[PDB]
Amino acid sequence: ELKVAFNKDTYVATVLDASGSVPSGSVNVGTFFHPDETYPDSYVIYHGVRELLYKRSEVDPAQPGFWPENITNMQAVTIDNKATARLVLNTSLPRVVSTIEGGKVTLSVVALGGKAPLKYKWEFRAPNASTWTAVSGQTTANLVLDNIDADKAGEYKVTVTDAAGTSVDSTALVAVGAYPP
């Protein structure tokens, strides 16, 4: 929920976060999900400000309005962003990794979003199951599996969660050939 303000004089649409403070002069014009719930990788912040100022009024950008009198000249507004950058995964886990019993498989994920305490998570699904099982201990980015056994095969999924609520995940299926004992 990115909150947008708007000052009618300077024509600056400050896209604040959910807990921002509206600048002296600007007025609340609405809220929109920057990572759109349904199509998450199609619209940008501009594509959300336009949908917010269309339902506004040139006479006073505080009361709602429509087509004959609304803020649709999208050249004078200057979006001034002060909302934390979306949690994006710069380097996701490989689609597939495959070693032999005894080898060392390492998985690494790099996240570039907005928060101080970017905490991590790790789960594990056996390749016949349905629910994810918590990988105890490893909670910091790179997960190292040394002397990997056959039972430690399946699908591993990281979950990079920021400070407030945002989370991004990425999976990596792991296979291990098992020579006879």
Binding site: R50, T72, M74, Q75
Partner: protein, 50 residues
């Protein structure tokens, strides 16, 4: 029925969308009815079986 369509390209690119990655197709029409003789229309209203 009047139909207006603008396919994406050099026909939808403008100062608010310099690239032109959108289109639309709007259909509008004008309709009206004048009843000269209400006596010549009969309506019987009843319920129907489920």
């Amino acid at each position: 029925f009047n139909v207006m369509t603008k396919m994406p390209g050099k026909e939808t690119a403008d100062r608010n969308d310099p690239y032109g990655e959108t289109g639309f197709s709007s259909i509008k029409w004008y309709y009206g009815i004048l009843v000269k003789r209400p006596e010549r229309i009969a309506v019987m209203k009843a319920v129907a079986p489920l």
